[PDB]
Amino acid sequence: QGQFFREIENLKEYFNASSPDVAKGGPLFSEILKNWKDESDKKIIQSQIVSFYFKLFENLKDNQVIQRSMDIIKQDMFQKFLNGSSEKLEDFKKLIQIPVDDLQIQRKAINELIKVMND
Amino acid sequence: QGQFFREIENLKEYFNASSPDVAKGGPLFSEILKNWKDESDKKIIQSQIVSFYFKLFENLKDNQVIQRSMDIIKQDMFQKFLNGSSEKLEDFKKLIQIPVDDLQIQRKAINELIKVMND
């Protein structure tokens, strides 16, 4: 099923705004997302393109205008990321922005071993 | 396997700078990253944890005292989440954080739906 089809995507024209350029000022994310999942050593990118999409709806608050549905598409990103378990939740709001003193703690700096190690 | 740290991890001691021994009436770092990986179904944020990191070393540039470090430390990290292909390096420069108009051309927000199936 290609599901939530017709009413939410429907308003994508709500973010495209007042008529119709093909987003024609620059061949951009068309250029970005070109060949991407290419070959089974993927993971990375898909998750992050999805990070700015996430700061996309968070930034666009226009309360009546689309707002409820940015929330409705951003909600299903869940299933785009992981959403197997509840804790998927926690981390992203964490995964927000602005480092502050109180969050430029870097001590646990070394941390990174744990991944590619695991034979 | 993965010793190379002798002169490089030794630098973390140079970040900390002058002293006390425990970075702060924190637990924070500790309370932060404790049980994350607990369930290997969540690949995703591991990439982003290292992103603030990219948001740290690309923030300090300490002139031959700490620079080289951050240089050296900054590098090893792609090799953690993804040393898989040559490409992704590019894919980060974009990932800078500040999307300055003419750069948040959200037209395309609509295609990533595809991760939907994958198999």
From Swiss-Prot, chains A, B:
Superkingdom of origin organism? Eukaryota
Sugar attachment sites are: 16, 83
> Which cellular component appears as one GO term in the record?
extracellular space
The entry's keywords: Antiviral defense, Cytokine, Glycoprotein, Growth regulation, Pyrrolidone carboxylic acid, Secreted, Signal
The entry's note on the tissues where this protein occurs is:
Released primarily from activated T lymphocytes.
Lipid metabolism found in the keyword field: no
Q: What is its main location?
A: secreted
- Per the record, residues carrying Pyrrolidone carboxylic acid are 1
Question: Which GO BP terms sit in this record?
Answer: adaptive immune response; astrocyte activation; cell surface receptor signaling pathway via STAT; defense response to virus; extrinsic apoptotic signaling pathway; Fc-gamma receptor signaling pathway involved in phagocytosis; humoral immune response; macrophage activation involved in immune response
Q: Name one GO molecular function term.
A: type II interferon receptor binding
Q: Where in the cell is it found?
A: Secreted
Q: Which family does it belong to?
A: Belongs to the type II (or gamma) interferon family.
Give the protein's biological function.
Type II interferon produced by immune cells such as T-cells and NK cells that plays crucial roles in antimicrobial, antiviral, and antitumor responses by activating effector immune cells and enhancing antigen presentation. Primarily signals through the JAK-STAT pathway after interaction with its receptor IFNGR1 to affect gene regulation. Upon IFNG binding, IFNGR1 intracellular domain opens out to allow association of downstream signaling components JAK2, JAK1 and STAT1, leading to STAT1 activation, nuclear translocation and transcription of IFNG-regulated genes.
| Assembly notes | Homodimer. Interacts with IFNGR1 (via extracellular domain); this interaction promotes IFNGR1 dimerization.
Instruction: State the protein's name.
Output: Interferon gamma
- Source organism of this protein record: Bos taurus (Bovine)
Protein's gene: IFNG
